[PDB]
Amino acid sequence: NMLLNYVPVYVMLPLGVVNVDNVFEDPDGLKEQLLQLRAAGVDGVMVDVWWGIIELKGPKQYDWRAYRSLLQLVQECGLTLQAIMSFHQCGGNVGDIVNIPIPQWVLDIGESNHDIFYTNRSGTRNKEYLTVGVDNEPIFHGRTAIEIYSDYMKSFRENMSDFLESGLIIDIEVGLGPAGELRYPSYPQSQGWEFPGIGEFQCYDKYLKADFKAAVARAGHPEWELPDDAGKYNDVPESTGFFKSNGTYVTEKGKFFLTWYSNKLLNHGDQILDEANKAFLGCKVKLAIKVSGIHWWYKVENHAAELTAGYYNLNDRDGYRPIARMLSRHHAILNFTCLEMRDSEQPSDAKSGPQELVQQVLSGGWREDIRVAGENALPRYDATAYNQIILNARPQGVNNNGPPKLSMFGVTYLRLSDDLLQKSNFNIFKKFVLKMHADQDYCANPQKYNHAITPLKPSAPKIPIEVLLEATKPTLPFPWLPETDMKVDG
Numbered sequence: 001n002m003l004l005n006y007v008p009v010y011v012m013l014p015l016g017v018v019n020v021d022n023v024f025e026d027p028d029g030l031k032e033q034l035l036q037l038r039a040a041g042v043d044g045v046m047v048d049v050w051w052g053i054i055e056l057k058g059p060k061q062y063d064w065r066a067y068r069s070l071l072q073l074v075q076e077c078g079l080t081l082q083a084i085m086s087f088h089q090c091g092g093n094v095g096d097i098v099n100i101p102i103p104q105w106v107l108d109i110g111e112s113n114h115d116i117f118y119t120n121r122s123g124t125r126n127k128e129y130l131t132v133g134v135d136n137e138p139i140f141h142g143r144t145a146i147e148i149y150s151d152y153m154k155s156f157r158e159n160m161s162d163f164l165e166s167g168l169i170i171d172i173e174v175g176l177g178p179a180g181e182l183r184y185p186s187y188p189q190s191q192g193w194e195f196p197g198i199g200e201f202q203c204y205d206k207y208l209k210a211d212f213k214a215a216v217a218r219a220g221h222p223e224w225e226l227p228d229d230a231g232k233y234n235d236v237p238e239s240t241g242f243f244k245s246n247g248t249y250v251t252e253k254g255k256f257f258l259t260w261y262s263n264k265l266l267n268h269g270d271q272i273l274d275e276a277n278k279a280f281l282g283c284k285v286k287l288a289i290k291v292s293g294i295h296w297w298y299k300v301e302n303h304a305a306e307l308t309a310g311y312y313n314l315n316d317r318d319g320y321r322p323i324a325r326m327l328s329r330h331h332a333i334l335n336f337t338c339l340e341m342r343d344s345e346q347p348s349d350a351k352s353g354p355q356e357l358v359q360q361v362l363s364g365g366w367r368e369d370i371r372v373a374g375e376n377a378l379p380r381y382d383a384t385a386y387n388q389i390i391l392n393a394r395p396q397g398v399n400n401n402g403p404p405k406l407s408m409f410g411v412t413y414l415r416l417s418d419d420l421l422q423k424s425n426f427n428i429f430k431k432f433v434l435k436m437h438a439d440q441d442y443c444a445n446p447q448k449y450n451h452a453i454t455p456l457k458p459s460a461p462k463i464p465i466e467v468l469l470e471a472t473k474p475t476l477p478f479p480w481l482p483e484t485d486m487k488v489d490g
């Protein structure tokens with residue numbers, strides 16, 4: 001059936017819908033908007049569940065009330081929900097609207113131990129998220145950073161058990177770094193980065209520096225140091241000793257460092273997803289993580305922006321398919337971004353390859369047999385953006401005689417705003433929702449399009465890092481159509 005071609009569309013809710021004071025501010029206003037979405041055929045919505053609002057008062061002082069009133073209203077409006085366990089800061093830059101820090105009691109510990117924060121070579125502390133170096137350090141009033149995350153997710157599961165039982169929540173995305181993405185904070189606008197700066201390595205806090213020196217001593221080179229020649233945030237790769245042609249990234253020292261640095265994210269990801277699987281075990285929910293789409297310098301050999309972010313991806317070393325393989329023991333979804341972007345829209349000197357990056361990451365996921373979802377990175381209201389999302393959602397088009405060979409598990413559109421709901425904009429969005437649904441009407445029962453959610457099974461066994469790293473072998477991507485066969489039309 002054509003309904004086997006249906007890809008669900010979710011919309012991201014406005015930022016700060018429950019504010020920093022844990023108040024669901026405007027139920028009436030949100031409700032008119034949600035009902036517009038329900039009539040346009042949208043399948044669900046997505047919301048951040050900010051750790052800095054919930055566990056603000058102190059360790060295990062959770063207040064779930066205002067998020068319970070929000071989930072109640074989404075359910076009354078007939079929409080499902082993707083929930084993000086957001087363990088990161090919202091906003092906080094100059095010009096930002098809603099600013100929600102991580103818990104003040106965590107920030108107070110940070111006042112006496114600055115090394116709980118990701119740190120660059122200059123010694124600047126990024127406070128958006130806790131460094132992977134403290135994941136198993138019992139320094140937060142007896143808890144390690146992963147026990148804080150685990151406890152938060154167990155409390156969410158217990159206190160929202162009625163919305164979980166009644167099937168409101170489709171999936172739980174677990175925030176794994178800055179902006180909820182599994183990466184280092186290598187391109188902080190708060191420290192002056194501007195596209196397409198290569199960014200900077202964020203491994204200089206004392207826990208990660210110490211771990212690196214222990215690791216180079218075991219490899220037989222105790223003298224090796226953390227990079228001192230990779231430049232600054234706004235550098236271009238050829239003006240740096242680390243990323244130029246035949247530079248340090250290609251030496252024994254550079255490769256060992258890049259393997260260590262990227263391996264820290266796989267393991268960070270693997271251990272917290274272990275806890276998420278335990279917390280939500282038995283629930284009719286899928287688990288997901290978000291990978292960032294870092295497309296600038298993708299078209300040059302060095303892939304510098306990708307490497308400073310922690311994705312050790314080169315033309316001869318796949319740095320994304322190890323992440324897909326890791327997610328398969330957890331039966332999790334890889335949620336990616338840049339689904340709307342065309343290469344032709346990027347400034348030429350950025351050496352930007354969003355279309356190719358997307359084809360590489362989604363093909364890597366389908367090859368590893370996991371489910372792949374995605375978002376647009378920037379707000380777009382035009383038909384060419386929507387037709388690019390429809391092309392990536394079904395790369396080889398609609399199958400008239402079955403399910404597509406390749407299709408995404410879903411797409412979340414970023415952000416519900418008054419601009420989206422403006423008349424000419426919302427008319428084009430309604431056509432996008434239709435074409436995503438492969439010209440079928442909204443289908444309330446996911447089982448009809450083969451998206452039924454079972455009870456969350458326990459994680460399959462730990463895959464050793466060397467088996468994870470066999471997925472670095474480069475493969476050719478699946479074939480993409482030039483343009484979609486299910487066009488919104490201009």
Ligand SMILES: OC[C@H]1O[C@@H]2O[C@H]3[C@H](O)[C@@H](O)[C@@H](O[C@H]4[C@H](O)[C@@H](O)[C@@H](O[C@H]5[C@H](O)[C@@H](O)[C@@H](O[C@H]6[C@H](O)[C@@H](O)[C@@H](O[C@H]7[C@H](O)[C@@H](O)[C@@H](O[C@H]8[C@H](O)[C@@H](O)[C@@H](O[C@H]1[C@H](O)[C@H]2O)O[C@@H]8CO)O[C@@H]7CO)O[C@@H]6CO)O[C@@H]5CO)O[C@@H]4CO)O[C@@H]3CO
Nearest residue numbers: 189194195293295337338341345346347376377378379414
């Ligand atoms: O707060 C900022 C922003 O943060 C989040 O986005 C992150 C994103 O997810 C990452 O992928 C990355 O983004 C970089 C991106 O990937 C690169 O491609 C590049 O962007 C270039 C565009 O790709 C390219 O098309 C062009 O953009 C032009 C637009 O096409 C054109 O329409 C106009 O853009 C204006 C917007 O239309 C307008 O709406 C307004 O945007 C604001 C948003 O409304 C607001 O929601 C917020 O956005 C968030 C975003 O939601 C998060 O996902 O702030 C926006 C900025 O104030 O203003 C735009 C103009 O300022 O003009 C532009 C060209 O000027 O060029 C760009 C740049 O070369 O760089 C991206 C990083 O800057 O990182 C971001 C940030 O973390």
